[PDB]
Design a protein around this ligand. Structure first.
Ligand SMILES: N[C@@H](Cc1c[nH]c2ccccc12)C(=O)O
Ligand SMILES: N[C@@H](Cc1c[nH]c2ccccc12)C(=O)O
Ligand SMILES: CC(C)=CCSP(=O)(O)OP(=O)(O)O
Ligand SMILES: CC(C)=CCSP(=O)(O)OP(=O)(O)O
Lengths: 428, 420
């Protein structure tokens, strides 16, 4: 019985017939990622015009910022975005059927001596996106980018001394788009790790210092920021959780979230709960309903528990993972709520994909997400229709969970590379 | 322009050798150019070069498992950060080439031997007839006490939640190649023993040496001192027992070396290991301490507490990590004080910088040849590498100060060398 194949997605096929590509890399990027992208839009019930709209913006504004087509045979920028270092990833917000994607902007100067840590390329991507969406605001972006990524002089200093960082993934910042309502919302992610190296500060001081400075002009972010920092400090100097990155929405400050992400090396339900409740600071009924769903997801997904080291910096393409990763959580500073809001990440990368898709579909059924439950596995398989589906262990990078307005919110972050007809065209 | 693949013994043996599978052939071409070039530059005689390379090819290569690639199942050895089961070291102070490997056979990693506790017996069987001075008395003792038996293996295999991402290596062998003969050593990793028995690695190792000391009372004093030193570091010590080695030679000639992993990478940490927390303060200890400090100053290890790294790295992935220090303490039967050897763990550091540090140290000791040829030879092992960007060749530099002689070895990535 012939099976569904994302390369048959009509919007993918039509756009392929329409599009001008002026280099090979972009063309490869399009054919590598668009089948899954178009198929995901379709199955998430985006109207046909919206499928076209989003795939065109992606092709015209984003693909030219994904650098050369990734192979193991030629140099490429390795992005912190995925374990394979590819600078593009789709996520399906399953609870709302919203498609999002994240990319790390890369341009000609990325990784050359003019931008050895890729701290400049993001401006050029913003330049292409800004005219498309009136609501895009860069005020907070500029602030965090200035405080938390390498400037030019820090870059040249670290490039000369790059013995200090060896094989460190260099990503400074990434952008993501939430696709909704014929519009998009823009988000950024900023990785202060190398900024920490060069300033001799810790990522925590950088992140919290920058947010405090911002709270001078935006006092409403201060109360959740204070609670967050008190929670972190309370975990002590041997905490298994450490600040890793910060995100904010690129819209007006009044509407923008700041999200502070902790890497949590202890994979256990207890560690997850502690993050969820900020060590028992959140005891409200809403938190507790959310908590029952965290526990349910924990029990379905069956992550391998225990302390997890940092993984190998990246996996070459084609390499089957043999690893399990730290959890993650972010804490959102809402301006209308004094208590930071958590979102937790079940880091499934390396786990059996069909098992994980089964855990997901069970969770979907239980939530009454009838259609999600019905279509999820079939659709997932269609993204990689030539794979040995039962042996895949690298599609599901993360499952997110938060509980917003008494509403379960879940996204899956999926390997997004060499999809559809591409493939034909020990210790765990 | 030097290239290890031009090494004559490697070229000539490559014309001579029968290989019965691809894996052994790949292993030979992957490792032999560096191994032959290393023997050449360490001034081994032509006959020794051939002799060591042949025994290596015939007795050892068939025990290295499938050729390591990222795209097929292989045994992941603790021996290297890439899980490859072969590594050459050069004892720079004596020009002695040594190598370590983890025996692997057909049953390794299967339900007949899921933790690779049996393969070693087969490798020993191949080596024994070549070296009369091999003795297994202490080896049998330690392996018995410190590695999984068949029963514990099946239990652990059925309960591998208890293992998780842990590298499973039970035991390794090393050959010191001197004077047309070789001395055999073993390294025994009691980590999984500890899981199944409920013992700490400390209890296992010290318990095992104490049971041995019944038959060999002379090892007891340095063992008591080592243990008193370790106990003195308390339950939150950043140093803990990791492995044990002994020579596979007659007990009267055999050293037992107990290894501590030291997560605190600092000069202070290294000095404390060197002097066993101030218990060693004789002139010879202090002379050695000077050299330790000088090495410290030259090598410039990234200081601070180092976490356990990823269990292993995929081949081809350059590291971004810095690792704990190591030290071993030797129990000599004629000396009541355990003798330390410390390890500067350079893995992940810029290799040319480390090579420059080493060259300077060689100069200062007047190892004038060592200093002249080291960088050149090192480059010739990986002649197509972007040498200045390499940060994974030097795994470790060892140092001890033996009968008032500086003793130094470098442990080097030994994989895909020469014209690979
Ligand atoms: N790979 C990222 C985590 C991540 C996965 N998907 C993402 C999408 C957007 C931002 C971050 C992510 C990290 O290690 O930190
Ligand atoms: N890889 C070993 C240390 C080591 C490096 N080279 C060696 C050679 C022989 C024995 C041990 C080693 C460990 O992690 O414990
Ligand atoms: C998967 C990880 C670690 C980060 C991305 S979180 P995100 O911005 O996608 O979160 P939301 O869009 O707010 O759900
Ligand atoms: C490099 C590490 C951690 C261990 C091996 S020590 P070794 O047996 O090679 O030391 P010697 O041969 O006694 O100098």
């Amino acid at each position: 019985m012939k099976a569904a194949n994302a390369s048959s997605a009509e919007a993918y096929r039509v756009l392929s017939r329409a599009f001008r590509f002026d280099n090979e890399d972009q063309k490869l990027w399009w054919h590598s990622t668009a089948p899954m992208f178009a198929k995901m839009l379709e199955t998430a019930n985006y109207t046909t015009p919206c499928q076209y709209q989003y795939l065109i913006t992606y092709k015209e504004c984003v693909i030219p910022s994904l650098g050369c087509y990734p192979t193991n045979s030629a140099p490429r920028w390795l992005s912190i975005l995925t374990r394979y270092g590819t600078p593009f990833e789709l996520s399906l917000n399953c609870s709302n059927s919203i498609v999002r994607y994240t990319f790390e902007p890369i341009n000609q100067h990325t990784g050359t001596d003019k931008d050895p840590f890729n701290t400049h390329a993001i401006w050029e991507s913003l330049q292409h996106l800004l005219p498309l969406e009136k609501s895009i605001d860069l005020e907070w972006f500029r602030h965090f980018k200035h405080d938390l990524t390498l400037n030019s002089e820090e870059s040249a200093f670290l490039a000369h001394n790059d013995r200090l960082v060896g094989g460190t993934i260099r990503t400074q910042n990434k952008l993501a788009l939430d696709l909704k309502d014929g519009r998009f919302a823009l988000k950024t992610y900023i990785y202060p790790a190398l900024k920490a190296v060069v300033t001799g500060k810790t990522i925590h001081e950088l992140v919290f210092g920058s947010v405090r400075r911002l709270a001078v002009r935006e006092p409403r972010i201060l109360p959740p920021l204070n609670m967050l920092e008190e929670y972190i400090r309370s975990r002590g100097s041997k905490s298994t959780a450490s600040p890793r990155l910060v995100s904010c929405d690129l819209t007006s400050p009044a509407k923008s979230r700041i999200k502070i992400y902790l890497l949590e090396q202890m994979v256990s339900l207890e560690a997850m709960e502690d993050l969820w409740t900020l060590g028992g600071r959140r005891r409200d009924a809403s938190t507790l309903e959310g908590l029952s769903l965290v526990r349910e997801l924990w029990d379905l997904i069956q992550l391998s528990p225990g302390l997890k080291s940092y993984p190998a910096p990246y996996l070459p393409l084609g390499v089957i993972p043999d690893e399990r990763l730290p959890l993650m959580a972010n804490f959102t500073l809402h301006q209308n709520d004094p208590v930071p809001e958590p979102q937790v990440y079940f880091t499934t990368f390396g786990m059996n994909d069909m098992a994980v898709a089964d855990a997901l579909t069970t969770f979907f059924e239980r939530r009454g997400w009838s259609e999600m439950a019905r279509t999820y596995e079939t659709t997932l398989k269609s993204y990689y229709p030539h794979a040995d589906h039962d042996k895949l262990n690298y599609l599901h990078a993360y499952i997110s969970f938060s509980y917003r307005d008494r509403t379960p919110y879940l996204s899956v972050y999926l390997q997004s590379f060499e999809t559809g007809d591409w493939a034909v065209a020990g210790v765990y």
